[PDB]
């Protein structure tokens, strides 16, 4: 961390992954269209 | 009322309710309490109904309110609240959140409402109630309209309880060529109407009946009944005689043209001008149509036709049918060679989008009213000088200009300020940038208003504050860079004359202070000029317009102003003792704006903005400019000498009395000169070094700024504890901008001892407080005011020093925390 000491350390903020043995897993928004069930509360489409 | 929010699904019924309530509000035999209840209900509903759902109510109000009769009082308040609440829905391109965005029709209605109210108020006699109720409405509508909105249905002629009266067709006659045209069109009309009947699945039967779907006139136009021929031919006879009365001369220029078929007419398209012609023709058709509905109203004996609102008021939905009818008539005219008379109206309307923007028309009207202002201010001056005249033949003109335009101008240019300052390259506003013509017009407005006010504050009297505020707003909304770089010579000369007159007035004020017209000039400069000039210079400095605006004659005028204000220093009159603050602020802004290092004449050879470089030696003598830049005026010392003098005073520990000029004018001037020229001198971000950058025109370095800040702190320390030091608050604010370049040694050199002294004083006063609390009765009551005053002076010193300390901390916190600093720790302790 490059500015944790400058602002946050003395204010009492803790790094998000301070005491984790392993790097934090991440997810990303994949832009590959996929078929999923029509949501039961979809604002526009209703299936009977 | 709140439950009406989110009622889209019954917009028809909500709209009907609104119309019914409005009609009830405008009712006879209705007592005042009842009318108040109705008005309260209407306003409460409009406070919650969505903006998109009030379109029809607006369409009725645009027709009603312009009259500005007694009934117009409540609608004005309703519109004021509606627009003040929903301004985003109309102005912002994105629109209001969850409410959508306005539409062309609503914007058109808003513009018509604004201009109708404006014209009616301008032509109406003064009335306090109406003016007070109307001015906020105009401000709200103007703030709602987008500055650059262009009216799609724009008109220039703008011809003209609705009374739709079509032109008298019977009066004029029908040409025989056009009678042949009308016969052909009647055959065509029968053919298309029978084609539509085919689309309806009609049949040719000897009897007429929809249920049987039999229709006896499904026979060729040759056999089409003569009476039926006459009635299918008469509408066009009347329409074409209306056109003749309109003087739309239509002639056979080009060639002319059972089983129902529609002859194709949509193939031929009316060009914009002929589309406008067809719009006028459809308006005439609407006039006949609404006349028939009128006749129905007289038959009823009292009522109102819902769709009796004029064509322009109508949205495209109701327009569309009549527009199509007129379009078909003109299309058949074209296929028959006949073409309407466009005259010159089309290309004298064409203008351009720039001339059609709302801001453009608003500024044009403001400038015309400014021309009227010249006339009646001249008359008022003449009568006030001699020959008492109470007639005031322009009385309503004065009242309008002072009660509507000034608050309007103020609010409008306070809101749409970024629009007039944005440029295509750099857009500061949410969306849209003012055209060069608009920028020139606003500049001309500012110059004209300043000239109007010059030496005439008393004439305006109680409105002078309003005029000065308007001048401030315009100055902060003026795009001097663009106006000067590319603009009419008239506008450029206007602005240059403003600066030159300001310089002359400042010189006269200075000489008078050094010791009738004297009092007039003093009041004018101390109330309008100095504030307005300061605001203009601050605006230029903030937007970095100095390198583009303050050149040549403007630069000479700024030299004169600067040199007079500074030369005033030698004087010590009580009047000066009161005017020093304003002059110092003006000088600080001028120093921040001026593009020449007037304190470093030696290095002026490298300044590309100096008049001595822009102008030629052959020129600069046709003016009064001296041969050498040093000789512009030598009263102001050079930077080195001025810094040396300030340091000498600070070290000698003089009091505010000994150097009033230095603390009030010189120091604020440097606190703006040094930061500006540091950026452009050596020891600056070098983006231009790749090129053969010419030598810097100045020598300002971080050392100068550090020395000045140290000297200012030393001076405040010297004057620390004085009973009356009202100048400290101004000095701290003026010295704040220069702190960012302070050097680390400043902490221990100046800040630590200063705050140490201040802590010592605080401790002493606290000890006195404790002694008083130990004592009681008169002993406690007495000296209580003493300790209160001591704490007052201590708080003054604290609020004079901490504002500087905070900035120094904010810039060195990073280094202090990264590397421990015992001096920083001691400062924390203090």
UniProtKB/Swiss-Prot annotation, chain B:
Comment block on domains: The calcium release channel activity resides in the C-terminal region while the remaining part of the protein constitutes the 'foot' structure spanning the junctional gap between the sarcoplasmic reticulum (SR) and the T-tubule. Pore opening is mediated via the cytoplasmic calcium-binding domains that mediate a small rotation of the channel-forming transmembrane regions that then leads to channel opening.
Inactivation phenotype: Perinatal lethality, due to severe defects in skeletal muscle development. Neonates do not breathe and do not move. Mutant mice show defects in muscle fiber development. Their muscles do not show a contractile response to electrical stimulation. In addition, mice display abnormal curvature of the spine, thin limbs, and an abnormal rib cage.
Protein's cellular compartments: Sarcoplasmic reticulum membrane
Domain of life: Eukaryota
Sequence repeats: 161-257, 258-362
Annotated function: Cytosolic calcium-activated calcium channel that mediates the release of Ca(2+) from the sarcoplasmic reticulum into the cytosol and thereby plays a key role in triggering muscle contraction following depolarization of T-tubules. Repeated very high-level exercise increases the open probability of the channel and leads to Ca(2+) leaking into the cytoplasm. Can also mediate the release of Ca(2+) from intracellular stores in neurons, and may thereby promote prolonged Ca(2+) signaling in the brain. Required for normal embryonic development of muscle fibers and skeletal muscle.
Reported tissue expression: Detected in muscle and myotubes (at protein level). Ubiquitous. Detected in diaphragm, skeletal muscle, esophagus, spleen, submaxillary gland, adrenal gland, cerebellum, brain and in testis germ cells.
Protein name (Swiss-Prot/TrEMBL): Ryanodine receptor 1
Family per similarity comment: Belongs to the ryanodine receptor (TC 1.A.3.1) family. RYR1 subfamily.
Signal peptide: none
Organism: Mus musculus (Mouse)
Post-translational modification: Channel activity is modulated by phosphorylation.
Description of how the protein assembles with itself and partners: Homotetramer. Can also form heterotetramers with RYR2. Identified in a complex composed of RYR1, PDE4D, PKA, FKBP1A and protein phosphatase 1 (PP1). Repeated very high-level exercise decreases interaction with PDE4D and protein phosphatase 1 (PP1). Interacts with CALM; CALM with bound calcium inhibits the RYR1 channel activity. Interacts with S100A1. Interacts with FKBP1A; this stabilizes the closed conformation of the channel. Interacts with CACNA1S; interaction with CACNA1S is important for activation of the RYR1 channel. Interacts with CACNB1.
């Amino acid at each position: 961390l490059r500015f944790f000491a400058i602002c946050g350390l003395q204010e009492g903020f803790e790094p998000f992954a301070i005491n984790m043995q392993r790097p934090v897993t991440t997810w990303f928004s994949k832009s590959l269209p996929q078929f999923e069930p029509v949501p039961l509360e979809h604002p526009h489409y209703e299936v009977a | 009322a709140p439950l009406f929010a989110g009622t889209e699904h019954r917009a028809i019924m909500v709209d009907s309710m609104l119309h019914t309530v409005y009609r009830l509000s405008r009712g006879r035999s209705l007592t005042k309490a009842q009318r108040d209840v109705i008005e309260d209900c209407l306003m409460a509903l409009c406070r919650y109904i969505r903006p998109s759902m009030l379109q029809h109510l607006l369409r009725r109000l645009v027709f009603d309110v312009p009259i500005l009769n007694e009934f117009a009082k409540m609608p004005l308040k309703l519109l004021t609240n509606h627009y003040e609440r929903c301004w985003k829905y109309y102005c912002l391109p994105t629109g209001w959140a969850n409410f959508g965005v306005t539409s062309e029709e609503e914007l058109h209605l808003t513009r018509k409402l604004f201009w109708g109210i404006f014209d009616s108020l301008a032509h109406k006699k003064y009335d306090q109630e109406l003016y007070r109720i109307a001015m906020p409405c105009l401000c709200a509508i103007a703030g709602a309209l987008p500055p650059d909105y262009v009216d799609a249905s724009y008109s220039s002629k703008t011809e003209k309880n609705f009374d739709p009266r079509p032109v008298e067709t019977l009066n004029v006659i029908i040409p025989e060529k056009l009678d042949s045209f009308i016969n052909k069109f009647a055959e065509y009309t029968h053919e298309k109407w029978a084609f539509d009947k085919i689309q309806n699945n009609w049949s040719y039967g000897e009897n007429i009946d929809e249920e049987l779907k039999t229709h006896p006139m499904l026979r060729p136009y040759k056999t089409f009944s003569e009476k039926d021929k006459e009635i299918y031919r008469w509408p066009i006879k009347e329409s074409l005689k209306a056109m003749i009365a309109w003087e739309w001369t239509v002639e056979k220029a080009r060639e002319g043209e059972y089983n129902p078929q529609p002859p194709d007419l949509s193939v031929v398209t009316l060009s914009r001008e002929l589309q406008a012609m067809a719009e006028q023709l459809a308006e005439n058709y609407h006039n006949t149509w609404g006349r028939k509905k009128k006749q129905e109203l007289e038959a009823k004996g009292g009522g109102s036709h819902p769709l009796l609102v004029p064509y322009d008021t109508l949205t495209a939905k109701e327009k569309a049918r009549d527009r199509e009818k007129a379009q078909e008539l003109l299309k058949f005219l074209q296929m028959n060679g006949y073409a309407v008379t466009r005259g010159l109206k089309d290309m004298e309307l064409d203008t351009s989008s720039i001339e059609k923007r709302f801001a453009f028309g608003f500024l044009q009207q403001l400038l015309r009213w400014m021309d009227i202002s010249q006339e009646f201010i001249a008359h008022l001056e003449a009568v006030v000088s001699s020959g008492r005249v109470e007639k005031s033949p322009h009385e309503q003109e004065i009242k309008f200009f002072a009660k509507i335009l000034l608050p309007l101008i103020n609010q409008y240019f306070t809101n749409h300020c970024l629009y007039f300052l944005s440029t295509p390259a750099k857009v500061l506003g949410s969306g849209g940038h003012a055209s060069n013509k608009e920028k020139e017009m606003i500049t001309s407005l500012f110059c004209k208003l300043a000239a109007l006010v010059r030496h005439r504050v008393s004439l305006f009297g109680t409105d002078a504050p309003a005029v000065v505020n308007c001048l401030h707003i315009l100055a902060r909304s003026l795009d001097a860079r663009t106006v000067m770089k590319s603009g009419p010579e008239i506008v450029k000369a206007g602005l240059r004359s403003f600066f030159e007159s300001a310089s002359e007035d400042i010189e006269k004020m200075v000489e008078n202070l050094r010791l009738k017209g004297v009092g007039q000039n003093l009041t004018y400069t101390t109330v309008a000029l100095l504030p307005v000039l300061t605001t203009l210079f601050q605006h230029i400095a903030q937007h970095q317009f100095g390198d583009d605006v303050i050149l040549d004659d403007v630069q000479v005028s700024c030299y004169r102003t600067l040199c007079s204000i500074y030369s005033l220093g030698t004087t010590r009159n009580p009047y000066v003792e009161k005017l020093r603050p304003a002059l110092g602020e003006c000088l600080a802004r001028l120093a921040a704006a001026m593009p020449v290092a007037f304190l470093e004449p030696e290095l002026n050879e490298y300044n590309a903005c100096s008049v001595y470089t822009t102008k030629s030696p052959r020129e600069r003598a046709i003016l009064g400019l001296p041969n050498s830049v040093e000789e512009m005026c030598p009263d102001i010392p050079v930077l080195e000498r001025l810094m040396a003098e300030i340091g000498g005073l600070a070290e000698s520990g003089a009091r505010y009395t000994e150097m009033p000029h230095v603390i009030e004018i010189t120091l604020p001037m440097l606190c703006s000169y040094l930061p500006r020229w540091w950026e452009r001198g050596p020891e600056a971000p070098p983006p231009a070094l790749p090129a053969g950058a010419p030598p810097p025109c100045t020598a300002v370095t971080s050392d100068h700024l550090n020395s000045l800040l140290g000297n200012i702190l030393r001076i405040i320390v010297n004057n620390l504890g004085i009973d009356e030091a009202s100048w400290m608050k101004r000095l701290a604010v003026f010295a704040q901008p220069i702190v960012s370049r302070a050097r680390p040694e400043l902490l221990r050199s100046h800040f630590i001892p200063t705050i140490g002294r201040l802590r010592k004083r605080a401790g002493k006063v606290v000890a006195e407080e404790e002694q008083l609390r130990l004592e009681a009765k008169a002993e406690a009551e007495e000296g209580e005011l003493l300790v209160r005053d001591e704490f007052s002076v201590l708080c003054r010193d604290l609020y004079a020093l901490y504002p500087l300390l905070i900035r120094y901390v904010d810039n060195n916190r990073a280094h202090w925390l990264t590397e421990p600093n015992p001096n920083a720790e001691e400062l924390f302790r203090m």
